[PDB]
Amino acid sequence: MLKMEAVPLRLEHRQEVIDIIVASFYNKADLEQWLKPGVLRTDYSDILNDIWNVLVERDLSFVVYDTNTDRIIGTALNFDARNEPEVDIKSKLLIVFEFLEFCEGPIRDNYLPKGLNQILHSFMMGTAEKLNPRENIACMHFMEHEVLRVAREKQFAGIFTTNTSPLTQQLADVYHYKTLLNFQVNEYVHSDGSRPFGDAPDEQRAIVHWKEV
Numbered sequence: 001m002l003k004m005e006a007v008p009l010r011l012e013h014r015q016e017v018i019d020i021i022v023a024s025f026y027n028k029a030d031l032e033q034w035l036k037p038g039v040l041r042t043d044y045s046d047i048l049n050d051i052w053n054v055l056v057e058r059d060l061s062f063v064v065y066d067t068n069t070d071r072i073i074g075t076a077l078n079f080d081a082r083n084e085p086e087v088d089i090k091s092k093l094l095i096v097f098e099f100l101e102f103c104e105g106p107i108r109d110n111y112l113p114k115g116l117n118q119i120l121h122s123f124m125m126g127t128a129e130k131l132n133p134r135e136n137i138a139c140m141h142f143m144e145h146e147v148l149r150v151a152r153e154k155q156f157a158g159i160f161t162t163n164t165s166p167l168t169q170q171l172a173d174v175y176h177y178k179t180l181l182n183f184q185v186n187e188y189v190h191s192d193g194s195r196p197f198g199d200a201p202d203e204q205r206a207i208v209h210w211k212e213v
């Protein structure tokens with residue numbers, strides 16, 4: 001059995017968190033696959049290095065240790081949705097973040113509560129690369145359960161994120177997240193007029209989830 005514990009994000013965790021995020025988003029993210037070629041591993045580490053200081057001092061993120069091996073197997077990066085640092089991304093990841101604002105924007109500022117310390121935005125979540133299906137699912141259940149803990153403890157109103165993989169979308173529904181948008185990713189039109197995820201099947205969705213604490 002996998003026994004885990006949650007530990008607040010520290011400055012030393014920079015390389016371990018990045019390697020978990022890179023070994024979980026690169027070539028596995030359901031959105032960036034349709035933007036090939038032109039998505040590199042450093043495109044995620046560049047964004048992480050840009051906000052690593054802000055991410056640690058906000059005191060909302062954590063890593064997950066395997067207490068048996070005392071090593072990091074997962075991490076959950078979170079921000080105040082009304083206090084997120086804005087990055088100037090220069091790769092094709094800007095298209096992804098503009099699309100996530102397409103989904104999150106109109107809902108966050110017109111339906112979710114106003115003011116700070118209200119919306120805890122689940123920014124990123126990852127697990128170690130060589131985890132088996134049992135440990136990866138167990139780690140996702142642990143990170144989901146612990147994100148709720150951080151929300152209630154920090155006196156937030158709810159948790160809010162956009163789920164782009166079928167596993168996170170099913171975990172969210174199973175965890176009683178309310179669905180506020182089930183957008184079809186191949187219908188999104190970029191500013192240049194094209195559809196960057198246009199080659200995606202109609203079954204691939206971008207679901208905007210929200211859950212009160």
Ligand SMILES: NCCc1ccc(O)c(O)c1
Nearest residue numbers: 029031096100123162164
């Ligand atoms: N906030 C939604 C989670 C997310 C963030 C960045 C991405 O590149 C991605 O595919 C998914």
Ligand SMILES: [Ca+2]
Nearest residue numbers: 076077122124
């Ligand atoms: Ca998260």
Ligand SMILES: [Ca+2]
Nearest residue numbers: 116117118119
């Ligand atoms: Ca808020």
